[PDB]
Amino acid sequence: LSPAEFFKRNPELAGFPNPARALYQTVRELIENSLDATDVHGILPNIKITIDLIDDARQIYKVNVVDNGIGIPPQEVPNAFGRVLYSKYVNRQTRGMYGLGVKAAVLYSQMHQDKPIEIETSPVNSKRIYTFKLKIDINKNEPIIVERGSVENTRGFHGTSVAISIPGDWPKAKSRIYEYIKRTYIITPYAEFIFKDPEGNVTYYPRLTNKIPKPPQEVKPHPYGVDREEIKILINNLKRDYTIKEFLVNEFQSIGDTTADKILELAGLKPNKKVKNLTEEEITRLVETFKKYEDFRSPSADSLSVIGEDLIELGLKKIFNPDFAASITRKPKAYQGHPFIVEAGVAFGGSIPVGEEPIVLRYANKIPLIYDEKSDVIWKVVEELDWKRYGIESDQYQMVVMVHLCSTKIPYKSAGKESIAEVEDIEKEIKNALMEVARKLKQYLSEKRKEQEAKKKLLA
């Protein structure tokens, strides 16, 4: 089965089990693309989100997201929204759990209602705004251009507007849609959002800074990460006729002149042989060799993008108005051929609510994880930590804890659930990060208690 057909038969595994989740997911897919279209390219995101009830009785909602991003070349629009791929190795951090991305919303839209999706886009420095009304052919997995136009652009405008009409359920999805937006804002203080909901409520999320974290850079795949099927994709993807040596050193990370030489012998392949002429045994051998070689450099972290200690603290402070906040961005680690970094943050006191458990905010590649929190490896680590060792004395406290995992391979427990898996190496690092911030909080609490006792005992 193709991704598209599998989606249609198993929507509940792709984030679309019912209209409420469909509505929530469509909103996230659009906001996520708009962020990746802006901040990754050095643009402060100005994002507008509107949801309108367009058919009361059948509960169809129109979701519109507008950004000031880099836009999309006109010739790329149809496929970007209306052609699902038959299978991409990730070499750059991107926002989103689901492989189909916005295409899942498009499919769902075309499967349950009749309006086309509406797109208006203008690439940087384009003299035109290009308009489209499109559908995806639900049987052929191909774009249908219903309408294609263009209008004159204005000075310095660039960006994209996307409108998709879908079955939805606002009352059910409402709280989690707001929470999604709120949590996105917390770690994206350099973005400005406007949200108008179907009831006509408007919420404004002002830009708090103009500092944008460093962008992800595409990297070549690291050998520990590739499967045969992946190799014979980089192979049939070459424009030149490389030699096997020519190919290990130019299409992979951490393979230099000398390392390739070794790999070649280990795998019993000849440098001079041309890669296109490999065999299902020469390959098997390469992969097994890859999996068994112990002298590779760790997967480069250039492909990752952190929120940053400053931005995490800025967001926690501005949104929660705590007495104290702290954060840590850990040094990169790696697992199964992919780099990963954990960042963590804590906010304590102030206007934050009293309760018997901390508020736990989970992020993966800069995206909120909203559902399935109790099965997530982050919840597990937070619950297992004994906060009394860190200065928390009462069984009721006011604390927010945040954890961000970024990687080119986030391990999820199950398709259609937003919970990160308990991979040992990742769990270990999440615990190390939380402890680092928990110790900053312990120091805060100990200094505060000392100041209080001093005033009580020494001041009149």
Q: For binding to Ca ion (CB under 5 A), which residues are involved?
A: 32, 96, 101
Question: Which residues touch 105 (CB under 8 Å, ≥6 apart)?
Answer: 22, 25, 26, 29, 30, 63, 164, 166
Sequence-ordered strand ranges (E) for 349-452: 359-364, 367-369, 399-407
Least distance (Å) between residue 288 CB and Ca ion: 33
Calculate helix-pair angle for 170-187, 19-36, nearest 10 degrees: 20
SS3 22: helix
Nearer of residues 276 and 389 to Ca ion, judged by Cβ: 389
Of 80 and 244, nearer to Ca ion (C-beta) is 80
**CB-nearer residue toward Ca ion: 214 or 388:** 388
Check the annotation: does 101 bind a ligand.
yes
In this structure, the number of other CB atoms found within 10 A of the CB of residue 294 comes to 4
Quick one: tokens of 42?
């050095």
Nearer to Ca ion, 265 or 357 (CB): 357
Helix extents (H) in 337-397: 377-384
Residue 103 labelled as part of a binding site: yes
* Cα 51 from Cα 180, distance rounded (Å): 14
Token pair, residue 63, equals: 């979701």
- What is the CA angle 248-250-256, rounded to 5? 65
> Quick check: 311 and 209 in contact, CB under 8 A?
yes
Q: How far is the CB of 150 from Ca ion (least distance, A)?
A: 27
Looking at residue 74, the DSSP 8-state letter turns out to be G
- Distance CA(426)–CA(336), nearest Å, equals 11
Among residues 320 and 390, whose Cβ is nearest to Ca ion?
390
**102 marked as binding residue:** yes
CA distances from 326 to 229, 309, 316, 435 (A): 44, 8, 9, 12
For Ca ion, the closer CB: 259 or 365: 365
Say whether 88 counts as a known binding-site residue: yes
- Taken as a whole, the chain contains a residue count of 460
Residue 98 Cβ vs Ca ion, minimum distance, rounded to whole Å? 7
How far is CA 380 from each of CA 33, 354, 360, 403, 439, rounded to the nearest angstrom?
A: 30, 21, 11, 12, 19
Confirm or deny that 87 is annotated as ligand binding. Answer: yes
- Which of 101/337 has CB closer to Ca ion? 101
Pick from 41, 40, 60: which is nearest to 51 by CA? 60
Ligand-binding site membership of 442 (annotated): no
Closest approach, Cβ 385 to Ca ion, in A, equals 5
Name the residue number minimizing CB distance to Ca ion: 96
- Is 62 a known ligand-binding residue? no
Residue 391 annotated as part of some ligand binding site? no
Could you tell me if 219 and 225 are in contact, meaning their C-beta atoms sit under 8 angstroms apart? no
Considering the complex, what minimum distance in angstroms separates the CB of residue 99 from Ca ion?
A: 9
Residue 131 or residue 188: which is nearer to Ca ion going by CB?
Answer: 188
In whole angstroms, the minimum distance from the beta carbon of 433 to Ca ion comes to 16
- Report the alpha-carbon distance of residue 158 to residue 69 in Å, rounded: 6
Question: The tokens of 246 are what?
Answer: 């020519």
Residue 306 beta carbon to Ca ion: minimum distance, rounded to whole angstroms: 18
State which residue, 32 or 376, has the beta carbon closest to Ca ion.
32
98 is in an annotated binding site: yes
- Tell the smallest beta-carbon distance from residue 241 to Ca ion (Å): 34
Closer CB to Ca ion, 31 or 186, in the complex = 31
Please indicate if the annotation marks 397 as binding a ligand: no
Angle between helices 424-458 and 377-384 (to 10 degrees): 40
- Give the strands of the sheet with 143-152, arranged side by side: 143-152, 128-136, 117-122, 159-167, 60-66, 46-55, 192-196, 202-205
CB of 71 to Ca ion, least distance (A): 17
For the CB of residue 97, give the shortest distance to Ca ion in the complex, in Å: 8
DSSP letter string over 46-60? EEEEEEEEEETTTTE
User: Which residue ranges are tagged as binding site for ATP?
Assistant: 33, 67, 87-88, 97-103, 417
**Residues placed in the known binding site:** 33, 67, 87-88, 97-103, 417
